[PDB]
Amino acid sequence: SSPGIWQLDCTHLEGKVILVAVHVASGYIEAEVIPAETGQETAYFLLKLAGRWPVKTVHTDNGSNFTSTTVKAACDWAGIKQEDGIPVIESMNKELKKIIGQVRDQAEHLKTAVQMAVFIHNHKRKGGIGGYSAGERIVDIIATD
Amino acid sequence: SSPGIWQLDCTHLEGKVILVAVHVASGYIEAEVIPAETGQETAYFLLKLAGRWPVKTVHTDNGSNFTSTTVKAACDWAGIKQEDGESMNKELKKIIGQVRDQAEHLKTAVQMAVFIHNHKRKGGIGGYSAGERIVDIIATDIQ
Numbered sequence: 472s473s474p475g476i477w478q479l480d481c482t483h484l485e486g487k488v489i490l491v492a493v494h495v496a497s498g499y500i501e502a503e504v505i506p507a508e509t510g511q512e513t514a515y516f517l518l519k520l521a522g523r524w525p526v527k528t529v530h531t532d533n534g535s536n537f538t539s540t541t542v543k544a545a546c547d548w549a550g551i552k553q554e555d556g557i558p559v560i561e562s563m564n565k566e567l568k569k570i571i572g573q574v575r576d577q578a579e580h581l582k583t584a585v586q587m588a589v590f591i592h593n594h595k596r597k598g599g600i601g602g603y604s605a606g607e608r609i610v611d612i613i614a615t616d
Numbered sequence: 617s618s619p620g621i622w623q624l625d626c627t628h629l630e631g632k633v634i635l636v637a638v639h640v641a642s643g644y645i646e647a648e649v650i651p652a653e654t655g656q657e658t659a660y661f662l663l664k665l666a667g668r669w670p671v672k673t674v675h676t677d678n679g680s681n682f683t684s685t686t687v688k689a690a691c692d693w694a695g696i697k698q699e700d701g702e703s704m705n706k707e708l709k710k711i712i713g714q715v716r717d718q719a720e721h722l723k724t725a726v727q728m729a730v731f732i733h734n735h736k737r738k739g740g741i742g743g744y745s746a747g748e749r750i751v752d753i754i755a756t757d758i759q
């Protein structure tokens with residue numbers, strides 16, 4: 472689908488909250504542990520995302536952190552179309568948790584283990600030895616020239 | 617320069633620390649406000665960077681934050697070569713001033729500045745933004 476389309480969700484592990492943005496066309500992920508699923512935390516994560524990739528549209532789970540006017544304000548500022556409650560990706564949250572289990576014993580804190588897992592996911596060749604990683608795919612899809 | 621070379625810098629503002637990474641060939645920036653310039657905050661910044669972009673080499677200032685065993689452990693794990701030997705960085709500070717009033721806290725103004733820097737077209741019609749350049753450089757290098 473469009474190069475500018477992201478899906479945002481949340482997943483919970485060890486009592487902490489991980490916000491995950493998936494670039495729908497490529498399966499590339501961005502993720503971070505945050506203190507809680509608040510408006511101010513969600514808006515900050517989105518503003519960081521939109522400053523790093525060209526984000527036109529976000530699909531959300533319509534959680535209350537999304538309905539907040541702080542999130543709406545960020546999205547307006549960044550020119551992002553927020554599509555709440557609009558639905559390979561339900562087992563993205565599952566995929567990321569698995570990878571986190573494989574590195575968890577190399578890091579003292581969960582937040583570091585999440586970043587390791589993001590690194591592994593985005594570098595992973597899919598479709599066997601002849602294939603491409605989510606990382607290669609997102610840049611091929613969004614490059615304008 | 618090569619597609620995998622970054623330069624990393626700290627800058628100090630309104631009483632806080634900003635870590636700034638410039639992708640040298642594109643001028644694209646990543647930045648984060650951190651409470652203090654520690655070896656743990658550095659390593660965490662570097663790992664987030666390397667899971668996002670193909671980081672092969674980072675050029676840094678001499679600081680002990682870049683020297684610490686945790687940054688060395690992160691660099692070895694992520695495959696980053698470290699080397700301890702600024703026009704997009706004065707630029708970033710200048711943008712922070714121009715929008716500092718658009719926002720409540722520093723953290724937010726910094727990410728608005730990164731947004732504006734990376735999306736801004738340079739030159740006239742036919743030009744590119746830094747965000748366009750990095751993606752183009754790296755996509756070309758893959759093919």
Ligand SMILES: Cn1ncc(CO)c1-c1ccccc1
Pocket residue numbers: 531532533555556557558
């Ligand atoms: C209406 N709504 N609100 C939140 C969600 C979760 O995507 C949904 C939804 C669930 C399944 C299919 C379509 C929307």
